[PDB]
Design a protein around this ligand. Structure first.
Ligand code: HEM
Length: 400
């Protein structure tokens, strides 16, 4: 339950927050985490839950620790104490792999994919529209990012069910496979494809990764499968759950929907403000050595949770942080991270979000939560929404 308190940790800093089941959960997950920002709570606290670990609670500390990779290492980035690249790597060896992955998901690739993204969104929406109802999480959000990966990687549609099953087992195991079995089966899938695309390449993400250079020499197969694996999984649960938080807010607030219906030009700014208010990731780092940080003695090997979610919710970074305002003049957040591991998919994610909102608001402008339905959130490394039953009158919609 509560791991015993290490000798170096003073008791006045103890705040037993459980990141997998925070106590205010039913009130909404972002609200449950923001208890860590109440005035009686120090900037840096120790929890005894989950093996015992630090938590930085304020934007200033979160950013600084992500900048200081010499003390705060990525060798162990999850609480509690997996071989994807470049997750576990600190600079300077991380730079090269990062440069390569950037070629496959960087801005020019995204600008090129933009209308394929739009057509996929339009066909999913068109199929739901006449029904007058859906579970948004299951019916739109889940099928969407996986299909964008198949486009990017030039993989055939028929492989989706099996691939989706494997990535589902890594994050929501049904018991059929351990984490390691699901990973190996994913590697079983990618290896022949990588091998073939070394010999005969295309312009897709797997071809580009497979023919890349590391340390002046060819990328190996081990390295290429471990990067392709991260490119797959990094863009699934984050996009599924983020779209859900956003659609939940818009379903509950007719006045914000209306604003975007009337001024669709505001949608890119609205996306940015939604990313701040409904931020959802909480990664960590491990201490490389003894280190005093903002008056607190940290010990070598200590783990520290640095919740990306909390920077944009900090009232010291944004005034009235729980209020959604699409006209904010300075939206400040670390929703996609900060420092050397800043999300490589951030440009693709923004386009997936913007396109989704533009297409949904055009075709189904008026929607609500299903009557009687109560929306359940879940908390962890990637917080999320269990399910999102939506309802609308089909007569108020339009086929395009
Ligand atoms: C709403 C959507 C997303 C959010 C909130 C998000 C969040 C994050 C965060 C916080 C990190 C850095 C964590 C750390 O510093 O340890 C990260 C890294 C990463 N993300 Fe995302 N992400 C999103 C979408 C995507 C997408 C669509 C992709 C596409 C494949 C992707 C691929 C990656 C990769 C490869 C990294 C590793 C960066 C590195 O270590 O160099 N992400 N993301």
């Amino acid at each position: 339950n509560l791991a015993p308190l290490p000798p170096h940790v003073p008791e006045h800093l103890v705040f037993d927050f459980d990141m997998y089941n925070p106590s205010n959960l039913s009130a909404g997950v972002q609200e449950a985490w923001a208890v860590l920002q109440e005035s009686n709570v120090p900037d840096l606290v120790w929890t005894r839950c989950n093996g015992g670990h630090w938590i930085a609670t304020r934007g200033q500390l979160i950013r600084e620790a992500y900048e200081d990779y010499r003390h705060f290492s990525s060798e162990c980035p999850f609480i509690p104490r997996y071989d994807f690249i470049p997750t576990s790597m600190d600079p300077p060896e991380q730079r090269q792999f990062r440069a390569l992955a950037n070629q496959v998901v960087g801005m020019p690739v995204v600008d090129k994919l933009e209308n394929r993204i739009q057509e996929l969104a339009c066909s999913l929406i068109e199929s739901l529209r006449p029904q007058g109802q859906c579970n948004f999480t299951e019916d739109y959000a889940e099928p969407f990012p996986i299909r964008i990966f198949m486009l990017l990687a030039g993989l055939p549609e028929e492989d989706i069910p099996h691939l989706k099953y494997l990535t589902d087992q890594m994050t929501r195991p049904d018991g059929s496979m351990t984490f390691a079995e699901a990973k190996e089966a994913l590697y079983d899938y990618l290896i022949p494809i990588i091998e073939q695309r070394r010999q005969k390449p295309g312009t897709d993400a797997i071809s580009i990764v497979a023919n890349g250079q590391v340390n002046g020499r060819p990328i190996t197969s081990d390295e290429a499968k471990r990067m392709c694996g991260l490119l797959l999984v990094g863009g699934l649960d984050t996009v599924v759950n983020f779209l859900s938080f956003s659609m939940e807010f818009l379903a509950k607030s007719p006045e914000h929907r209306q604003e975007l219906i009337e001024r669709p030009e505001r949608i890119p700014a609205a996306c940015e403000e939604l990313l701040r208010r409904f931020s959802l990731v909480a990664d960590g780092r491990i201490l490389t050595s003894d280190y005093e940080f903002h008056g607190v003695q940290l010990k070598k090997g200590d783990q520290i949770l640095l919740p990306q979610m909390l920077s944009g919710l900090d009232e010291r970074e944004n005034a009235a942080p729980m209020h959604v305002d699409f006209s904010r003049q300075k939206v400040s957040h670390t929703t996609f991270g900060h420092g050397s591991h800043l999300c490589l998919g951030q440009h693709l994610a923004r386009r997936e979000i913007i396109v989704t909102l533009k297409e949904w608001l055009t075709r189904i402008p008026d929607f609500s939560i299903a009557p009687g339905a109560q929306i359940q959130h879940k908390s962890g490394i990637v917080s999320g929404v269990q399910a999102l039953p939506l309802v609308w009158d089909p007569a108020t919609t339009k086929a395009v």
